[PDB]
Design an enzyme around this catalytic site. Structure first.
Site, PDB file in Angstrom:
ATOM      1  N   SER A 131      26.982   8.895  -6.454  1.00  0.00           N
ATOM      2  CA  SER A 131      26.405  10.155  -6.912  1.00  0.00           C
ATOM      3  C   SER A 131      24.935   9.934  -7.250  1.00  0.00           C
ATOM      4  CB  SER A 131      27.109  10.677  -8.163  1.00  0.00           C
ATOM      5  OG  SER A 131      26.424  11.786  -8.688  1.00  0.00           O
ATOM      6  N   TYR A 144      29.995  10.922 -16.297  1.00  0.00           N
ATOM      7  CA  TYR A 144      30.071  10.959 -14.846  1.00  0.00           C
ATOM      8  C   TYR A 144      29.091   9.987 -14.225  1.00  0.00           C
ATOM      9  CZ  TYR A 144      30.118  12.868 -10.147  1.00  0.00           C
ATOM     10  OH  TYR A 144      30.171  13.048  -8.777  1.00  0.00           O
TER      11      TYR A 144
END
Length: 218
Positions: A131, A144
């Site tokens: 990510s 995250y």
């Protein structure tokens, strides 16, 4: 990009980037097995294994059984992942725990169960979906992004552990800058197929950020 005859495993294959990647490999001729906790979509033109990739015992049983039946694992794609947002001091225990169990532990388990196969066959490719939150701090994504940074670090050390076996191990990090609309899964899959292909044969330990330039190169 031709993957005829090749055996490809994809995690997170029930939806999102994993599903788009599995489908792209099927269309490129591969023999694809998808792994995910749920397969709630209406169509899966590939073999499915429904399990929790965060669960080390389940992954061991299923992967050992499948490796008994295949000669070569040509491509592993780690694409499982969940997004749970929140200010760091408001995030629930459950969201913190599940974020790490899935986003890091899933790939860890897949690596534990496939590294011997990669070593014994020589060669193959691994692509892991990280990510851009692993590249720059993002408000609301502290857990995250941290999980994706662990995942990236893990995948790179695995790549070093397997480099002597000729295995290529790379990452993709999805999202007038950003340039263009947010990248669709179909377009992330294109980048994964590129990194899995013979056109990337001397590319390893690389991470391509596919977010319209939002990290400004970071």
């Amino acid at each position: 990009l031709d993957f005829h005859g090749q055996t490809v495993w994809v995690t997170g294959a029930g939806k999102g980037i994993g599903y788009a990647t599995a489908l792209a490999f099927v269309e490129a001729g591969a023999n694809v097995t998808g792994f995910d906790l749920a397969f709630d979509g209406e169509g899966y033109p590939f073999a499915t294994e429904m399990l929790d990739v965060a669960d080390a015992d389940q992954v061991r049983d299923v992967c050992a059984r499948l490796l008994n039946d295949i000669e070569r694992l040509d491509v592993l794609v780690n694409a499982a992942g969940i997004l749970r947002m929140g200010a760091t001091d408001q995030l629930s225990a459950e969201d913190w725990q599940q974020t790490f169990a899935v986003n890091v532990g899933g790939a860890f388990n897949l690596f534990q169960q496939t590294m011997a196969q990669f070593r014994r066959q020589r060669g193959g490719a691994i692509v892991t979906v990280a990510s851009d939150a692993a590249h720059t701090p993002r408000i609301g994504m502290s857990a995250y992004g941290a999980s994706k940074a662990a995942l990236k670090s893990l995948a790179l050390t695995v790549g070093l552990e397997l480099a002597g076996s000729g295995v290529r191990c790379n990452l993709v990090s999805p999202g007038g800058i950003p340039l263009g609309k947010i990248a669709r899964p179909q377009e992330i899959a294109n980048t994964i197929l590129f990194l899995a292909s013979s056109h990337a044969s001397h590319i390893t330990l690389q991470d391509i950020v596919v977010d319209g330039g939002s990290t400004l190169g970071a």
